[PDB]
């Protein structure tokens, strides 16, 4: 997350931290995700497409630090890793960048709600907030595009939804942005998601309720002028989410 502020998991209690285990070596952070029901985390396919092997991923909920424990956190294995069959990224855009992780603890349990662990509501079908409204993003991604290091503490910032008409201008992204995506950025291009934030949530108030409007997907650099963050538009994937979580 470029700009914004350090936060606690209490303020983003749906946030899932996803790591990869390397047999014979290290554990590395991969991506964020969002708890949509006790047993299901939603993330981005491009986080996993190169190595779609459920056994080597680890999911935490209630976790606000990258390399230490948070009181009340839960650690999960991935019982099922579901990627979108029409994911592609032959050009700049990532299409259908959405994934599901069924989570199961060592003792065989799903997530247990608390002050630090909570589901986030899905939007109603095709229901998005209006352009020019504020949304929150969160993650353990880079603080500057060219950093080698990552923040130790979870961050969040606020970005604004940008119209497709604006985002599809040639000097923005042209036809790379589709109606299955949403653009969001800072009016002054000072804050954005960045590498390490994919899979995490774009959270907007909708029908009285914090709602998973988007999933962090892609962009040209991070916080660059006329290059918004691009987010999977969740309200266009409800049937996919419903049929794969059954």
């Amino acid at each position: 997350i470029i700009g914004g502020e350090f936060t606690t998991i209490e303020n983003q209690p749906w946030f899932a931290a996803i790591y990869r285990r390397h047999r014979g070596g290290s554990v590395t952070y991969v991506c964020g995700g969002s708890l949509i029901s006790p047993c299901w985390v939603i993330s981005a396919t491009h986080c996993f497409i190169d190595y779609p092997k459920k056994e080597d991923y680890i999911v935490y909920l209630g976790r606000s630090r990258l390399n230490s424990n948070t009181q009340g956190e839960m650690k999960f294995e991935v019982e099922n890793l579901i990627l979108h069959k029409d994911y592609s990224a032959d050009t700049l855009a990532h299409h259908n960048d959405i994934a599901l992780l069924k989570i199961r603890s060592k003792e065989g349990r799903c997530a247990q709600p608390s002050r630090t662990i909570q589901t986030i509501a899905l939007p109603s079908m095709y229901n998005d907030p209006q352009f020019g409204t504020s949304c929150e993003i969160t993650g353990f991604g880079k603080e500057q595009s060219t950093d080698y290091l990552y923040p130790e503490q979870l961050k969040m910032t606020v970005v604004k939804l940008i119209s497709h008409r604006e985002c599809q201008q040639p000097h923005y992204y042209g036809s790379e942005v589709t109606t299955k995506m949403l653009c969001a950025a800072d009016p002054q291009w000072k804050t954005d998601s960045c590498q390490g934030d994919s899979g995490g949530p774009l959270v907007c108030s909708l029908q009285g309720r914090m709602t998973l409007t988007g999933i962090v997907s892609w962009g040209r650099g991070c916080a660059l002028k006329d290059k918004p963050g691009v987010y999977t538009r969740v309200s266009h994937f409800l049937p996919w989410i419903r049929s794969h979580t059954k």
Partner: nanobody
Framework: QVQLQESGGGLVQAGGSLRLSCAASGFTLDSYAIGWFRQAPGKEREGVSCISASGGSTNYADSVKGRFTISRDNAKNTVYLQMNSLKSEDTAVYYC????????????????????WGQGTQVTVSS
């Protein structure tokens, strides 16, 4: 503790062959896109070759295409650069790199990338 380490460099005669190795530790390079770069005296760094995460495709810079081959051995957790028909202009420090945006992989995805570099191996081709 992810790292890469190059080996195999040295002095070779023009027209000859050389194989460089890039050995990973702390991770397995089998599911990451890997590449080789080089930097010759007084010149900027140049991409040489890369292999995709799946291993289904490889790419070559104009200056080495048709002469160099990149490959990956998952049993040895090592990537190779086979350099045939060497020329004096191939004299450089060679570096391998794993999981960087744009290196045989997307440059727009916002997942975390390892962005690992090796330390270099010197290749000198005498004509």
């Amino acid at each position: 503790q992810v790292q890469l380490q190059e080996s195999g460099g040295g002095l070779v005669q023009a027209g000859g062959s050389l194989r460089l190795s890039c050995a990973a530790s702390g991770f397995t390079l089998d599911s990451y896109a890997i590449g080789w770069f080089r930097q010759a005296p007084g010149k900027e760094r140049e991409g040489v070759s890369c292999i995709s995460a799946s291993g289904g495709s490889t790419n070559y810079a104009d200056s080495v295409k048709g002469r160099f081959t990149i490959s990956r051995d998952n049993a040895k957790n090592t990537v190779y650069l086979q350099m045939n028909s060497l020329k004096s202009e191939d004299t450089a420090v060679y570096y391998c790199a794993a999981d960087h945006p744009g290196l045989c992989t997307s440059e727009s995805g916002r997942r975390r990338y390892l962005e690992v570099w090796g330390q270099g191996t010197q290749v000198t081709v005498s004509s």
